[PDB]
Design a protein around this ligand. Sequence first.
Ligand SMILES: [Zn+2]
Ligand SMILES: [Zn+2]
Ligand SMILES: [Zn+2]
Ligand SMILES: [Zn+2]
Ligand SMILES: [Zn+2]
Ligand SMILES: [Zn+2]
Lengths: 518, 513, 517
Amino acid sequence: SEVPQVVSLDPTSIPIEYNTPIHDIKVQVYDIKGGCNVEEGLTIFLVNNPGKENGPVKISSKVNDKQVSEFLKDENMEKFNVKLGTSKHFYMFNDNKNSVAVGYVGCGSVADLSEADMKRVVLSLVTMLHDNKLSKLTVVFEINVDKNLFRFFLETLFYEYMTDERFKSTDKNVNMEYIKHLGVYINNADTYKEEVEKARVYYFGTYYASQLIAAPSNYCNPVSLSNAAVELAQKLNLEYKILGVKELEELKMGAYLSVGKGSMYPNKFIHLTYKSKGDVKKKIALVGKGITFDSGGYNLKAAPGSMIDLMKFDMSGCAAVLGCAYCVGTLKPENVEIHFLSAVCENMVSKNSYRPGDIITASNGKTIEVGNTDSEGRLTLADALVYAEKLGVDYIVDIATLTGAMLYSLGTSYAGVFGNNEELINKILQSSKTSNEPVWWLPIINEYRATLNSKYADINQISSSVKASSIVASLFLKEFVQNTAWAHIDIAGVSWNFKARKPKGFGVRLLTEFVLND
Amino acid sequence: SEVPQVVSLDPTSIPIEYNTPIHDIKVQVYDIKGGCNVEEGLTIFLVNNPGKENGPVKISSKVNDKQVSEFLKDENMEKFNVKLGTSKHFYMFNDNKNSVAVGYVGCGSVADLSEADMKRVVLSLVTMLHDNKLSKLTVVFEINVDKNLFRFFLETLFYEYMTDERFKSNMEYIKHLGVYINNADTYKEEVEKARVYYFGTYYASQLIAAPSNYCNPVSLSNAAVELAQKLNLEYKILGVKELEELKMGAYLSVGKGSMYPNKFIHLTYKSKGDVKKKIALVGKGITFDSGGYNLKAAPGSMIDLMKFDMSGCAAVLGCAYCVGTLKPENVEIHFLSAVCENMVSKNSYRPGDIITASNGKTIEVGNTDSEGRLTLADALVYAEKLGVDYIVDIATLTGAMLYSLGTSYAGVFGNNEELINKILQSSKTSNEPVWWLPIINEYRATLNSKYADINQISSSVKASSIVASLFLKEFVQNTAWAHIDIAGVSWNFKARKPKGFGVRLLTEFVLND
Amino acid sequence: ASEVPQVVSLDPTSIPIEYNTPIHDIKVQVYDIKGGCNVEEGLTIFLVNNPGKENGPVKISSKVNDKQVSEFLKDENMEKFNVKLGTSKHFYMFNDNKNSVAVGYVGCGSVADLSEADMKRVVLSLVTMLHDNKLSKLTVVFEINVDKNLFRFFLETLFYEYMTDERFKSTDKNVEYIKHLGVYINNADTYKEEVEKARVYYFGTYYASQLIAAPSNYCNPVSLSNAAVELAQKLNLEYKILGVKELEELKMGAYLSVGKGSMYPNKFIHLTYKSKGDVKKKIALVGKGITFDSGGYNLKAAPGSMIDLMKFDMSGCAAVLGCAYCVGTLKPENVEIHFLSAVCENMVSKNSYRPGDIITASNGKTIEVGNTDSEGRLTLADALVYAEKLGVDYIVDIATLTGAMLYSLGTSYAGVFGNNEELINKILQSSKTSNEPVWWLPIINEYRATLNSKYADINQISSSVKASSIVASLFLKEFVQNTAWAHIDIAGVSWNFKARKPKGFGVRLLTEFVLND
Ligand SMILES: [Zn+2]
Ligand SMILES: [Zn+2]
Ligand SMILES: [Zn+2]
Ligand SMILES: [Zn+2]
Ligand SMILES: [Zn+2]
Ligand SMILES: [Zn+2]
């Protein structure tokens, strides 16, 4: 519970913002058939033009203001097209002699907007929200979106709107003011109303994980991260259990303890549990890789391209699991029992660190010959998977920033999923569709299994013959799940938004949608 | 065409073996239910032990020789185990005092063998054949196989048994092969299909394994003409003067630095009846990829292997043999490959050069080693003009496949899910594994060139297999198209030889669609 | 024995050593060929060659005491098999008593005189027939002509490759070992004094291989010195393990600086074998004992550095300990042998020694460290000063010193340096009788000027010469002033990369050198 320090100025906790400005926004959804009242703030129309490649703009909603209706006439919009991401600002006075602001965001000519397209639409909306001091934003949906896409629009709006300033001191944004009300006019408004407070819950779960990842490793360490998870479980009223070094020694978690041997922070295993009111028909263990910093060990990240400065994000899988724990603990699904697990530690260089070539013993008795200390994620997950299978669950899903090879296979957009069971993978892909967090199915090639045969240990940690590390790492994790249906999501390439210089919070919505639809 | 030479000792043709000793093997299939005759040659039992990992060997078939029957008793075969790939074989005299050999190959403890497991079993069998002088081999299947897999057994056995000694200056080849297997009467029909599939793979391997001084754009097209004349295929070889006038500037820019002129191969198989499906198979034909001015100099570039950059074209030519031999129904197949050589010279195309494809698109060259997609783009514009229903291209395009799927599974991309599913189905029946990878449209923006219509490569998205597929997709406008990247699976690094990957996949695609 | 420090309770506190291997249970019986062969139970293998004829026909030239087996092995049936080096075939037949027997052969090529490498190729084929078969006896018939050293080498290599180290397997395992070994050879009475010599030389190589293959979390300075104490106790050898407090009093600043960054205290191993009859020969054997070489702040980060193999940087120490077993068992006389090793671990830490640090050796020489990964010559320097103070006649050190050996002699031959005719020639002669190949390499004095330090007495590394193995010998030569000294660089030959296992190189070479003086 107590965070060790080198100097008295070292932080002793991760700062977390629970009551964000988003939570103060009053959201109201109105029916488009009754017309829109433009009154104050900024009113944005989501306009399309099917067939016409960036064709002209046409406002097709009844506006309850004569002055603003005259401005939005078709003959006045020669000059704006529906090109995806394009936006314009208009200034005028309404019927009550009051100054109002109206605009639009182009949504292209494809009637069905993709997940990446909708993100581009939302980003244009946020640019109009920044550098402006508005009190209400009003969005008029002149496009077709299902209930999932409408919720995805809200989550992305909330997530991109918020600015994380926990670590600013002499450089906070002085011109930063958030709107207090959000009005939405949409076709068949009553069916979308229920998605609003689900989107806000999905927003914070994603933002909570982003807060943990963006926190650097001197703030986010094994002790302070598990302390925050306890704090989260107490606010939600979940059962919680943090396993210390002495308990992990008795469980013979040799692979997990060997990774964190060289750290000044003791290993901390997070075990949160949400149980249902009523009978349970699904037991699920969610495992997240929790490496608060990955220096690589004695296989140090020194080669060009290793991005050693970004390795604070090697606990992104753990953050996604904890972010889901908030969503599950808040929405309270039932007929289900969920275990949120993470073997948290730090991979450091020290005189106490574990070495390349060392042979360690996992909690299931298997001996492993270490070939690369930078492949430490699969070592900690192995003991976490054995711990998860002892829980007697139906599905085991692990999520981890495991292999940089994911960048060269799927890139920065789609995550990769591996597994030993087909229906679980299909359930993961279905959750990917409804959560709009894209994931692609990749194979576990058994022909590569022979390259993990160690001359002395039961199994090798790495191959060093096969260059397909994402597949080889799944071969290794498969060796520690004997009978339970298990899936593995590699988020090493998609977790960090390199262009936006901030985390994505990837996995929170995907895991929760998987929990909510089973 | 005449092959240019620098010195008179440079070869002027690719030596090709059509008349392999495999074609002399008499193949016989018999039913296992009736017992085995083990009196001539070498008899190998394919045995497993379900449940008991590394369990003992137990033969359950009645043999006719009393001496061999005494050897096969359980007290003598429990001293051997069934570990996948393990093998033992002994020499003895039969009841008539004739020389025979009996042995086994372990098939593990999993009743269902994958293609990789069967490859390891065949490898053990072939090792015994390279040390054997007996003229007969009998293989007894005490395991469960369909003959998508048993045809795979024959195909792989034929391919690994054959040894390429064309460049060379303790074993004889068997004259008979006996097979004891359940339901042999059904199991006859794949024998001659395996022999056709074997040679198409072996013929393609011969072109790939042929070094670049032997296999050049001129000699490779000459071999394609010779193959089309023996098969009775329509053939057309396009020269530089004709390629310039089809305005195939991307393809011609790749080969400028070569001493060999560009040669475009176009073979055609037409049906005797009416045509109900038109298919175009496009193959990347880089007989040597030095990388150009982006020279393959970094560690790992494998410049010494780069004669294999025409493996996609070899797979198309290998499929042309199988299609031309089995002569399928109601189909019209076009076999295309834009063959050239990527060299360093005063005449080479440069990094930063802007070239014009045959469809009018301007391309900004970012790396000369990404030359495959440049030739494929002009070949794809040529293929769509043929008015086909499906366009399938196969290419050793991007080394990123070694970090994605590795050296076992190839990746397939496409713009049409029905064609992709048809390729995936062909992967199962041909037993050449392929995995479907996505065309991520979010990466399309990184191909936007500031000056040209499109960038050849991306500068930010470090995932070339998806980016290269996004580039090729812009050169197929209306036809359902798929792209198979075989850069990782083309060369067998452990065996120091090509695999001939793609030949059986393409043939099964045309023979079953 | 000291207590091994641990970070977590799951850290191992001792190296597992197998002393009673299945090889020790094999009853070995040798017969003379001029009396006929009796084809018994199990497997009977003939070693056949054909001088002059490359891949010539197989011809069995030994009397078999079985009419049926002699008919099988007639010339008109061996015919279809050839003698290519490494080829093997299996035969199944029934003998005169209506019993089924197993017979075969391994081809030994032409050449007639087989090299150590060629014999290993023959032995490997022999082990393949021993593997995956459940035989109780193997019989070997020598129809190839071999001397006593090559016959002993055949048994040593066969025992070593047949043995399988499963100390670190848990869930993994499989099948058994034969209980009897028969050998038929001409003039058999002369060859069989080598049988029990081969069994002794085998375990010394396997014991060294056990220590090398043991990883660094198992094999560290504390646990490695404890094993030497345990070995000395079983062999009744005098032993002394020097701790940091004693090494500080001996002013071993070069040796102490290397181990500063380790969690394991430095341990100097000093074993002694003394003869009963008056001692007319005094020998000190020094082995490099770096249980793990991270390289220090000059971290092994380049692609070729092979840091995951650096548990083998104590191969020199294991070779000396393997010699201690062989010498301690056969008990030669008129010799004192000192088995020395300055054991430590080269790690990265806040306590590690830095590139550029100037340290003082136990002989007063100051050294400027130019690269922390050149820690071998620093630990050896203090060990040689310690060795010379013992008043010995010969000092021989063995070390996995420089990776440059992979670019000079490769993976087959080790390099020997020295300051004296006969110690080098006696070592080179021992290489011939031990069949462990070593090549004599020069100490080029022209390179000595490149070790001139601007501030310290001598530089640890050169600033211009890329011949690291020769420069290291020049550095080590500076710490032996009056005694005959030789240096064996085994950095290229210690690990069998293809077989992913140690070779135990040096045990038989060092032991033969002690036994032939
Ligand atoms: Zn790592
Ligand atoms: Zn990591
Ligand atoms: Zn290229
Ligand atoms: Zn290429
Ligand atoms: Zn070193
Ligand atoms: Zn060293």
